[PDB]
């Protein structure tokens, strides 16, 4: 029994309103009970919490419990990028023993907050991998006799970095430079392998900064790249670099249509919207691997959805509709019209809400989703998804009343900002961890695939053999 102070009145029995553990699990990406009835092509945001994400939960995030045939989605994980120390064997002491280093994912954030009491001070990159980026950028920054065009051609780009061999790389670079020729100052992005300058021998090949970017929840085996020839060390780690071609400062510049009445004072006086740089008047895709982008700055990625994934989702959703719908729902004005909530009506409302979410997230056009990526994040892009990239420069504050009259441009109060042809310089805006293509389940494999059978083990066998074996656990 527990002590309780006596009282001559009635005792109140509070039942409480805690934060739902299910919601916390869903946002953390570690919910193994949720079944999404309809598969969609829309980015999924998850916030890593104290390294609770792992290969086990990420496998389900890739292949949801509803029964999927492919990772047909973009997966943004705020934070969650890990950094792995090198490993070495202690021979001293009682005997030989490995020391593996470790992953400082949650322990070391990407950017520390700079609050000061007494042009403000902010961090725009990840401090842990600032120095590893330093070497990659210095490899190109040299102004020597050998032009950096050939360096980027050979060393930097692989066989295929963007939309359609050794000659192929040179013609690709030629097209890019010719396109960039007409502008006094332009830039473009590419995927490039690590330079030899960033690999020091130890025979252990280490990185320049002593730290390798990694995601502890990566499933499958990393992409292997050949120099037959040997494997390129740290070939799965790649860099998406921006090449140019030829402490932020704040500054303050000098109706509500959704309401019925007229508001004595507006409910939301001000807006705020991210400021992105101008794109010169090309996208890039990887058709051979599954990509994990780890931004080193604040990027805006516009992802173009492949027609293959779009058709897959549409056809599978319609198959579910015809299998489960009875066609008794009739035809209400809008799906959420009062009436007997048949299973068919519930399911139709579910699909309608899903379509509304997809069209709202996508911009006005095929389909393109705008994604704000930050340092510390990790964005998983499956195979075949296209995307263009820009850099975000800050934020604005827009008078709602003024923007109702003339425009957001004129309606500005305060803006916070952060700051053929030839290649003048190179930056690295992201590290791409490329992994060997994940399996695409055949129709029978998808039919017999059950999320429960992968709640403890079988993840690595699934990802190695390729999809789940039919007859996995029965006969």
């Amino acid at each position: 029994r527990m002590p309780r102070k006596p009282t001559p009145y009635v005792r109140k029995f509070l039942e409480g309103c805690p934060l739902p553990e299910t919601l916390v699990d869903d946002i953390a990406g570690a919910n193994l009970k949720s079944m999404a009835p309809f598969f969609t092509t829309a980015p999924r945001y998850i916030v890593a919490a104290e390294s609770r994400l792992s290969k086990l939960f990420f496998h389900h995030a890739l292949y949801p419990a509803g029964g999927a045939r492919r990772p047909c989605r973009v997966l943004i994980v705020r934070g969650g990028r890990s950094v792995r120390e090198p490993s070495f064997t202690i021979n001293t002491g009682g005997g030989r023993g490995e020391v593996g280093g470790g992953s400082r994912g949650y322990r070391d954030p990407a950017r520390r907050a700079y609050f000061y009491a007494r042009l403000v001070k902010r961090a725009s990159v990840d401090g842990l991998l600032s120095p590893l980026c330093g070497v990659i950028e210095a490899h190109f920054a040299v102004g020597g006799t050998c032009n950096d065009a050939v360096a980027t051609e050979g060393d930097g780009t692989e066989s295929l970095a963007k939309g359609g061999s050794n000659v192929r790389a040179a013609k690709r670079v030629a097209r890019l430079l010719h396109d960039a020729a007409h502008h006094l100052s332009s830039f473009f992005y590419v995927h490039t392998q690590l330079p030899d300058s960033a690999l020091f021998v130890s025979a252990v090949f280490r990185l320049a900064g002593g730290l390798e970017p990694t995601v502890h929840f990566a499933v499958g085996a990393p992409l292997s790249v050949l120099q037959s020839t040997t494997v390129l060390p740290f070939g799965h780690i790649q860099c998406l670099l921006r090449v140019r071609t030829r402490t932020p400062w704040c500054n303050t510049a000098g109706v509500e249509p959704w309401k019925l009445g007229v508001s004595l004072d507006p409910k939301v006086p001000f807006f705020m919207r991210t400021l992105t740089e101008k794109r010169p008047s090309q996208l890039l895709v990887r058709n051979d691997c599954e990509t994990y982008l780890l931004p080193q700055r604040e990027l805006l990625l516009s992802f173009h959805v492949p027609e293959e994934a779009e058709a897959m989702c549409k056809e599978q959703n319609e198959e579910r509709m015809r299998r489960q719908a009875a066609l008794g729902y009739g035809s209400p004005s809008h799906v959420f019209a009062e009436g007997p909530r048949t299973f068919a009506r519930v399911l139709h409302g579910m699909k309608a809400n899903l379509a509304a979410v997809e069209e709202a997230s996508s911009t006005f056009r095929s389909r393109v989703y705008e994604v704000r990526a930050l340092p510390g994040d990790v964005v998983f892009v499956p195979r075949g998804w296209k995307y263009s990239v820009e850099r975000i420069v800050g934020t604005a504050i827009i008078d709602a009343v003024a923007a109702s009259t003339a425009s957001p441009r004129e309606a500005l109060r305060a803006v916070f900002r952060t700051a053929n042809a030839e290649i003048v310089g190179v930056e690295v805006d992201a590290f791409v961890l490329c992994y060997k293509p994940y399996p695409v389940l055949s129709n029978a494999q998808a039919s017999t695939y059950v999320a429960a059978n992968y709640v403890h083990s079988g993840i690595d066998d699934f990802y190695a053999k390729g999809g789940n074996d039919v007859y996995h656990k029965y006969t």
Partner: protein
């Protein structure tokens, strides 16, 4: 990490030897020199005495900077340090990487450190200045005073490297506070030596014979100082026998004045026509009087004879 030493003067070779010895092949070592034969000799000696990590020898700042992560300069003069850091075509800070670290141990002016840190920040690198105080034998044995000024996280990153050749390492603040700490320490040393000279001369004037006891009395009382504790045993004989020439010492009047020569440049203004520096200026007067008397390289204990001259300039100016 890859740590490379460039200074290689007289006080820089011990830093390279200590880094090579205590590296234990845990960090790579680099050595740069103006002439390759000298650095070859240094590497040969270090390997003969025991080398745990392979050592590379550099003639050019371009290779030096584009290879190593940490650069350590231990040079002789401000002009040499400026040559190494900024004004050279292959200047270290000009061609510095976005993340590499550069540390300077030579005693340069606060403004010199200002330009160095500003340019390093422009290029994205981190520069923190750590002037050193001690003897070359103190460096051999691994005892030194480093007063580093720069970024706190970079300083924390640099702790382990410093301890390989330094005992007392402190963080004086941001934006090159190490040079100010060294400068103020020298000024205070000079002032205390002057005051000790005054006290012993006054004791002799009063006619107290046993100085052995008076030394302990002063050391146990207030106003005690290591400068007194050092110069007393010599000053006692030097005042009772003013004829004998003060002996030569490694630490000299010329060295103190050279190291004080940065104070005027580091102070804001001298046009006020007044001295907001009574004691410090009085000590400087006597030090300069001793230097101009042909006693520049002799011991710091020679201020006794020229303190009286330390009044002529005060009266006339």
């Amino acid at each position: 990490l890859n740590v490379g030493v460039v200074g290689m003067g007289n006080m820089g070779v011990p830093i390279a030897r200590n880094l090579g010895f205590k590296a234990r092949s845990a960090m790579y070592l680099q050595i740069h020199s103006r002439a390759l034969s000298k650095a070859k000799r240094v590497c040969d000696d270090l390997s003969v005495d025991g080398a745990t990590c392979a050592m590379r020898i550099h003639d050019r700042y371009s290779t030096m900077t584009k290879w190593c992560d940490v650069i350590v300069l231990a040079l002789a003069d401000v002009k040499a340090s400026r040559h190494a850091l900024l004004e050279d075509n292959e200047s270290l800070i000009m061609n510095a990487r976005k993340g590499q670290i550069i540390v300077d141990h030579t005693t340069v002016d606060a403004e010199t450190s200002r330009e160095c840190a500003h340019e390093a920040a422009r290029r994205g690198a981190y520069f923190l200045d750590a002037p050193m105080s001690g003897s070359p034998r103190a460096c051999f044995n691994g005892q030194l005073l480093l007063m580093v000024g720069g970024d706190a996280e970079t300083f924390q990153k640099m702790l382990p490297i410093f301890h390989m050749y330094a005992d007392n390492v402190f963080h004086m603040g941001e934006s090159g506070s190490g040079t100010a700490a060294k400068m103020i320490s020298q000024a205070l040393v000079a002032s205390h030596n002057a005051a000790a000279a005054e006290a012993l001369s006054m004791a002799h004037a009063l006619g107290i014979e046993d100085q052995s006891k008076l030394v302990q009395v002063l050391d146990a009382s207030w106003g005690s100082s290591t400068m007194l504790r050092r110069n007393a045993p010599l000053l006692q004989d030097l005042i009772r026998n003013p004829d004998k020439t003060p002996p030569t010492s490694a630490v000299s009047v010329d060295r103190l004045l050279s190291d004080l020569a940065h104070l005027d440049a580091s102070l804001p203004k001298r046009g006020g026509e007044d001295e907001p520096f009574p004691v410090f200026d009085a000590a400087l007067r006597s030090l300069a009087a001793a230097s101009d008397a042909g006693m520049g390289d002799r011991d710091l204990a020679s201020v006794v004879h020229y303190i009286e001259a330390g009044e002529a300039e005060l009266r006339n100016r």
